[PDB]
Design a protein around this motif. Sequence first.
Motif, PDB file in Angstrom:
ATOM      1  N   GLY A   1      -3.126 -14.542  17.573  1.00 62.25           N
ATOM      2  CA  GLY A   1      -3.172 -14.689  16.028  1.00 62.25           C
ATOM      3  C   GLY A   1      -2.573 -15.721  15.123  1.00 62.25           C
ATOM      4  O   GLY A   1      -1.749 -16.498  15.591  1.00 62.25           O
ATOM      5  N   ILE A   2      -2.904 -15.704  13.833  1.00 57.38           N
ATOM      6  CA  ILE A   2      -2.381 -16.702  12.904  1.00 57.38           C
ATOM      7  C   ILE A   2      -0.849 -16.697  12.851  1.00 57.38           C
ATOM      8  O   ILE A   2      -0.238 -17.725  12.556  1.00 57.38           O
ATOM      9  CB  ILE A   2      -2.951 -16.505  11.474  1.00 57.38           C
ATOM     10  N   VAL A   3      -0.228 -15.562  13.172  1.00 57.90           N
ATOM     11  CA  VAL A   3       1.229 -15.474  13.162  1.00 57.90           C
ATOM     12  C   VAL A   3       1.796 -16.201  14.375  1.00 57.90           C
ATOM     13  O   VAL A   3       2.759 -16.949  14.274  1.00 57.90           O
ATOM     14  CB  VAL A   3       1.697 -14.019  13.208  1.00 57.90           C
ATOM     15  N   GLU A   4       1.187 -15.971  15.527  1.00 63.03           N
ATOM     16  CA  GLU A   4       1.623 -16.618  16.757  1.00 63.03           C
ATOM     17  C   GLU A   4       1.451 -18.141  16.662  1.00 63.03           C
ATOM     18  O   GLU A   4       2.391 -18.901  16.871  1.00 63.03           O
ATOM     19  CB  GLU A   4       0.797 -16.090  17.937  1.00 63.03           C
ATOM     20  N   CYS A   7       3.222 -19.376  12.799  1.00 63.02           N
ATOM     21  CA  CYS A   7       4.576 -18.922  12.467  1.00 63.02           C
ATOM     22  C   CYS A   7       5.601 -19.060  13.593  1.00 63.02           C
ATOM     23  O   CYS A   7       6.608 -19.748  13.420  1.00 63.02           O
ATOM     24  CB  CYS A   7       4.533 -17.462  11.993  1.00 63.02           C
ATOM     25  N   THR A   8       5.361 -18.407  14.730  1.00 57.74           N
ATOM     26  CA  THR A   8       6.316 -18.449  15.846  1.00 57.74           C
ATOM     27  C   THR A   8       6.284 -19.816  16.539  1.00 57.74           C
ATOM     28  O   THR A   8       7.214 -20.176  17.264  1.00 57.74           O
ATOM     29  CB  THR A   8       6.059 -17.288  16.828  1.00 57.74           C
ATOM     30  N   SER A   9       5.208 -20.564  16.292  1.00 55.16           N
ATOM     31  CA  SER A   9       5.031 -21.930  16.793  1.00 55.16           C
ATOM     32  C   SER A   9       4.646 -22.772  15.565  1.00 55.16           C
ATOM     33  O   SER A   9       4.866 -22.327  14.436  1.00 55.16           O
ATOM     34  CB  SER A   9       3.953 -21.993  17.878  1.00 55.16           C
ATOM     35  N   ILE A  10       4.089 -23.970  15.746  1.00 55.52           N
ATOM     36  CA  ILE A  10       3.737 -24.793  14.585  1.00 55.52           C
ATOM     37  C   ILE A  10       2.243 -24.772  14.269  1.00 55.52           C
ATOM     38  O   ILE A  10       1.402 -24.850  15.168  1.00 55.52           O
ATOM     39  CB  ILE A  10       4.175 -26.261  14.788  1.00 55.52           C
ATOM     40  N   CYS A  11       1.934 -24.647  12.978  1.00 49.44           N
ATOM     41  CA  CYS A  11       0.558 -24.615  12.482  1.00 49.44           C
ATOM     42  C   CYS A  11      -0.094 -26.005  12.406  1.00 49.44           C
ATOM     43  O   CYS A  11       0.564 -27.043  12.556  1.00 49.44           O
ATOM     44  CB  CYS A  11       0.535 -23.982  11.092  1.00 49.44           C
TER      45      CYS A  11
ATOM     46  N   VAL B   2       1.169 -28.639   6.029  1.00 51.76           N
ATOM     47  CA  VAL B   2       0.522 -27.628   6.842  1.00 51.76           C
ATOM     48  C   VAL B   2       1.153 -27.634   8.241  1.00 51.76           C
ATOM     49  O   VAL B   2       1.115 -26.638   8.972  1.00 51.76           O
ATOM     50  CB  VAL B   2      -0.989 -27.939   6.913  1.00 51.76           C
ATOM     51  N   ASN B   3       1.793 -28.748   8.577  1.00 55.37           N
ATOM     52  CA  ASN B   3       2.423 -28.901   9.875  1.00 55.37           C
ATOM     53  C   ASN B   3       3.926 -28.623   9.773  1.00 55.37           C
ATOM     54  O   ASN B   3       4.740 -29.506   9.482  1.00 55.37           O
ATOM     55  CB  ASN B   3       2.115 -30.300  10.389  1.00 55.37           C
ATOM     56  N   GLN B   4       4.246 -27.345   9.962  1.00 55.02           N
ATOM     57  CA  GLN B   4       5.605 -26.809   9.915  1.00 55.02           C
ATOM     58  C   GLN B   4       5.489 -25.322  10.262  1.00 55.02           C
ATOM     59  O   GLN B   4       4.375 -24.796  10.395  1.00 55.02           O
ATOM     60  CB  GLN B   4       6.228 -26.984   8.511  1.00 55.02           C
ATOM     61  N   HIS B   5       6.622 -24.661  10.474  1.00 55.77           N
ATOM     62  CA  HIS B   5       6.589 -23.237  10.777  1.00 55.77           C
ATOM     63  C   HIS B   5       6.320 -22.530   9.442  1.00 55.77           C
ATOM     64  O   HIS B   5       7.078 -22.683   8.480  1.00 55.77           O
ATOM     65  CB  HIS B   5       7.917 -22.783  11.398  1.00 55.77           C
TER      66      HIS B   5
END
Lengths: 21, 30
Positions: A1-4, A7-11, B2-5
């Motif tokens: 998911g979008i959280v994994e 959030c827990t890694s980098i987007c 967009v590139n960050q936690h």
Amino acid sequence: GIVEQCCTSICSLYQLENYCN
Amino acid sequence: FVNQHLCGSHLVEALYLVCGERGFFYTPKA
């Protein structure tokens, strides 16, 4: 998911748009 | 930007700016 992925890694702009309508 | 936690309201805020008038869906448990 979008959280994994962003959030827990980098987007990315690539995964963020997979959640738009 | 967009590139960050991005967690919680920070990720909902990012999705809002990127999707624009397209909208989006936030499903933490999926």
